[PDB]
Enzyme design. Structure first.
Site, PDB file in Angstrom:
ATOM      1  N   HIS A 141      -3.586 -10.308  15.580  1.00  0.00           N
ATOM      2  CA  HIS A 141      -2.841 -11.433  16.129  1.00  0.00           C
ATOM      3  C   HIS A 141      -2.149 -11.084  17.440  1.00  0.00           C
ATOM      4  CE1 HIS A 141      -3.441 -12.291  11.885  1.00  0.00           C
ATOM      5  NE2 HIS A 141      -3.161 -13.561  12.110  1.00  0.00           N
TER       6      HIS A 141
ATOM      7  N   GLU B  96      -9.624  -3.815   5.618  1.00  0.00           N
ATOM      8  CA  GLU B  96      -9.186  -2.813   4.651  1.00  0.00           C
ATOM      9  C   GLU B  96      -8.216  -3.418   3.640  1.00  0.00           C
ATOM     10  OE1 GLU B  96     -10.415   0.009   3.546  1.00  0.00           O
ATOM     11  OE2 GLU B  96      -9.091   1.520   4.441  1.00  0.00           O
TER      12      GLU B  96
ATOM     13  N   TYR C  68       1.761  -4.337  14.237  1.00  0.00           N
ATOM     14  CA  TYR C  68       0.657  -3.662  13.568  1.00  0.00           C
ATOM     15  C   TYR C  68      -0.183  -2.880  14.571  1.00  0.00           C
ATOM     16  CZ  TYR C  68      -3.099  -2.946  10.174  1.00  0.00           C
ATOM     17  OH  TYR C  68      -4.036  -2.387   9.330  1.00  0.00           O
TER      18      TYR C  68
ATOM     19  N   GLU D 147       0.793  -1.225   0.000  1.00  0.00           N
ATOM     20  CA  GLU D 147       0.000   0.000   0.000  1.00  0.00           C
ATOM     21  C   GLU D 147       0.827   1.277   0.000  1.00  0.00           C
ATOM     22  OE1 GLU D 147      -0.300  -2.355   2.665  1.00  0.00           O
ATOM     23  OE2 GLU D 147      -2.418  -2.428   3.260  1.00  0.00           O
TER      24      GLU D 147
ATOM     25  N   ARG E  23      -3.174  -1.486  14.393  1.00  0.00           N
ATOM     26  CA  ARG E  23      -4.632  -1.565  14.336  1.00  0.00           C
ATOM     27  C   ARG E  23      -5.052  -2.929  14.875  1.00  0.00           C
ATOM     28  NH1 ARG E  23      -6.563   0.966   9.779  1.00  0.00           N
ATOM     29  NH2 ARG E  23      -4.334   1.196   9.254  1.00  0.00           N
TER      30      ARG E  23
ATOM     31  N   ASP F 151      -2.228  -4.993   4.272  1.00  0.00           N
ATOM     32  CA  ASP F 151      -2.446  -5.206   5.696  1.00  0.00           C
ATOM     33  C   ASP F 151      -3.468  -6.317   5.920  1.00  0.00           C
ATOM     34  OD1 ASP F 151      -0.596  -3.273   6.433  1.00  0.00           O
ATOM     35  OD2 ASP F 151      -2.082  -1.664   6.591  1.00  0.00           O
TER      36      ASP F 151
ATOM     37  N   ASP G  12      -5.958  -6.615   8.011  1.00  0.00           N
ATOM     38  CA  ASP G  12      -7.319  -6.261   8.386  1.00  0.00           C
ATOM     39  C   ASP G  12      -8.222  -6.260   7.153  1.00  0.00           C
ATOM     40  OD1 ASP G  12      -6.045  -4.108   7.263  1.00  0.00           O
ATOM     41  OD2 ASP G  12      -6.460  -2.710   8.898  1.00  0.00           O
TER      42      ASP G  12
END
Length: 685
Positions: A372, A98, A325, A7, A327, A94, A96
């Site tokens: 995780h 998204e 991460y 990204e 988030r 990522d 998630d």
């Protein structure tokens, strides 16, 4: 050769350095597709569909229309070239929903004929990236359907609710469901402050000495407060309600200045006697490792970062291989991270401060695929905060501060408990013919433990006591005499409820189940940008427009801004992400009406379309743009209206045979809504 899509360019360069040659790494700069943002975005094939501008075919199971952004097309072109001479494809977005949706859109757009592999990871290190690239997994379509359900839900919500806000409040007002709920939280706290009425209460503060009946009591002098007078408890701040009257609880006595001075006068000359003294041992377990919620809270209270700034710094730290991460809703540490934290802990604080057993803070997460581990330092061995302070030299000069915060939290999570004692002190005396009781509370810290590495900061507005603060009191015996040094009658007043800060707002959004690790900072930033909320120091203050919109939604579309319904919708989206609920059934149910969902919800009340239609025609407007405040000293209702010039005050006065006639005044953002009292209202007229 092999292709790998991420990204951001930073993630691309780091992954390129760790994967080595034989891999090509390119970034997609976020989303490559989206719903149509204008009529010009609709392709010629779909211009025959009357639903194309909305981008959602509600009559065809909410078929979306995905178009490539005009500035993103070139990117796709590049990705369509590299795919020619490569023999394998890797989607490294990522983990998630998204990033999963970005991967899915990339597959739909590029349409590759070579094998495709999705690799996921929550830390950017050479072992974690090499391990992820060698053990891929299938593309979780349930996450794609959850993200897509969110996108379509927001598009339909805006489509149905924005015109109501344009006609009834003000044009160019952007709608927003969860934003309007958080705005409702803030507006509710402000209303509570406005309706609040203080109440006075008096007690007696006493300075007591014990070095005469105990020539070695440390501390020699301590403080105590009057609690009882002739068997009746003395009122405190907790015994009054928001209107200033005594609560319907236990029987108390309210004291004023004359009574307190009289009791202190009738108490002077005599001595006091220790009635009770109780010490209780306590242990305090270390704080869990950081998650997004707690990281934003502690970063706000201790570093004065906003949630947005916290998430920006944490993004730069994550993409450069410093933290895991950012988030996540998980506080879990893997065995290597636990061993790292225990190594640094033993190295910095000693063997006695290490927990005798490895500590795990496992809690229920919303989805085992998206989160995780906790937010912690990355690698088999944690980079020292001093080395990170060396490497991050230049424009980013707070990233080392956020990193050091995460490091201290993670190391402190694996340290020993904090032992101590709590003390209760009941003293008695005789004021004239009335027995009086003086209470005193204490708290010590025998062993700091993890508090030597991390101490949480108290909320600025809420106030309170930190977990390492001591209130030391001397060791006393029942029946011991005490000498009075000073008797000062003390006066107090009940305070209004505290305003929210970013930290306490994030905590509220998490407790109510309204926010997710992906949405806290965006909710706060968005409600600040659109002008609903501004800042006074660290306090969030609602504007009058926020009162107007919150009032409209409360009065005529209450289900949209109810806390339990909004939390329920978030839980159902999460249920779609796990494969227990289907996107189609949920969208039909919410938009057109069904039989699923919590009682009296939008889905159980006819659906969004029918409810907005029914409730829209069920109003006469009128006072929608008027926030009622109070009445004046003549019986005329005063309120605030929001117009083209902004907020202005208005009441109604007679006007020579042609009565009535309104009266208007002007007020700026200098006056917060709770300060705009009747006296201030008369001064501005």
């Amino acid at each position: 050769r092999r292709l790998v899509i991420v990204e951001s360019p930073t993630k691309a360069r780091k992954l390129a350095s760790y994967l080595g040659s034989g891999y090509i790494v390119e970034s997609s700069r976020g989303h490559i597709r989206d719903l149509p943002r204008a009529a010009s975005d609709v392709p010629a094939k779909y211009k025959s569909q009357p639903w194309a501008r909305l981008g959602v075919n509600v009559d065809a199971d909410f078929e979306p229309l995905y178009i490539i952004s005009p500035e993103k097309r070139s990117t796709v072109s590049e990705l369509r070239g590299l795919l020619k001479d490569v023999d394998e494809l890797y989607l490294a977005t990522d983990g998630d929903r998204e990033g999963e949706a970005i991967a899915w859109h990339l597959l739909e757009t590029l349409k590759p004929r070579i094998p495709v592999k999705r690799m996921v990871f929550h830390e950017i290190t050479e072992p974690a990236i090499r391990a992820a690239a060698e053990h891929p997994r299938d593309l979780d379509i349930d996450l794609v359907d959850a993200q897509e359900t969110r996108r379509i839900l927001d598009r339909l919500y805006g489509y149905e609710v924005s015109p109501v806000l344009w006609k009834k409040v003000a044009p160019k007002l952007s709608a927003g469901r969860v934003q309007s709920v958080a705005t409702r939280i803030i507006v509710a706290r402000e209303r509570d402050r406005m309706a609040f009425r203080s109440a006075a209460y008096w007690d007696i503060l006493a300075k007591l000495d014990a070095s005469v009946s105990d020539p070695d009591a440390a501390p020699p002098t301590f403080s105590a407060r009057l609690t009882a007078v002739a068997g009746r408890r003395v009122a405190t701040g907790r015994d009054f309600d928001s209107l200033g009257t005594l609560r319907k609880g236990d029987e108390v006595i309210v004291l004023d200045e004359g009574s307190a001075t009289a009791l202190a006068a009738g108490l002077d000359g005599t001595q006091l006697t220790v009635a009770s003294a109780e010490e209780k041992p306590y242990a305090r377990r270390p704080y869990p490792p950081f998650m997004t919620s707690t990281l934003q809270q502690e970063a706000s209270r201790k570093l004065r970062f906003s949630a947005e700034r916290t998430m920006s710094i944490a993004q730069r730290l994550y993409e450069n291989g410093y933290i895991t991460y950012m988030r996540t809703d998980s506080t879990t540490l893997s065995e290597s991270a636990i061993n790292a934290a225990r190594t640094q802990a033993r190295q910095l604080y000693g063997d006695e401060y290490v927990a005798p057993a490895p500590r795990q803070y496992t809690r229920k997460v919303k989805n085992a695929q998206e989160a995780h581990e906790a937010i912690r330092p990355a690698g088999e061995t944690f980079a020292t905060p001093d080395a990170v302070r060396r490497e991050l030299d230049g424009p980013n000069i707070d990233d080392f501060r956020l990193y050091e915060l995460i490091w201290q939290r993670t190391v402190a999570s694996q340290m020993a408990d904090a032992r101590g004692m709590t003390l209760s002190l009941r003293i008695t005396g005789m004021s004239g013919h009335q027995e009086v009781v003086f209470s005193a509370t204490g708290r010590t810290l025998t062993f700091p433990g993890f508090l030597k590495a991390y101490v949480e900061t108290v909320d600025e507005l809420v106030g309170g006591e930190a977990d390492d603060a001591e209130r030391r009191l001397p060791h006393l015996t029942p029946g011991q005499r005490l000498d009075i040094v000073e008797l000062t009658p003390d006066g107090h007043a009940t305070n209004p409820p505290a305003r929210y800060t970013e930290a306490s707002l994030v905590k509220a959004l998490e407790e109510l189940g309204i926010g997710r690790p992906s949405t806290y900072s965006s909710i706060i930033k968005t409600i600040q940008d659109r002008g609903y909320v501004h800042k006074k120091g660290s306090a969030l203050v609602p504007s009058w427009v926020a009162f107007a919109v919150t009032g409209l939604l409360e009065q005529h579309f209450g289900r949209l801004v109810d806390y339990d319904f909004t939390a329920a919708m978030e839980d159902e989206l999460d249920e779609i992400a796990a494969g227990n609920e289907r996107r189609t059934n949920w969208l039909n149910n919410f938009y057109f009406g069904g039989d699923h969902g919590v009682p009296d919800s939008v889905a159980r009340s006819g659906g969004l379309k029918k409810l907005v239609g029914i409730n829209l025609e069920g109003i006469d407007a009128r006072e929608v743009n008027s926030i009622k405040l109070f009445d004046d000293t003549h019986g005329r209702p005063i309120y605030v209206r929001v117009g083209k010039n902004g907020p202005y005050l208005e009441r109604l006065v007679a006007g020579d045979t042609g009565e009535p006639t309104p009266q208007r005044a002007n007020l700026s953002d200098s006056i917060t809504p709770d300060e705009l009292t009747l006296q201030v209202a008369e001064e501005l007229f």
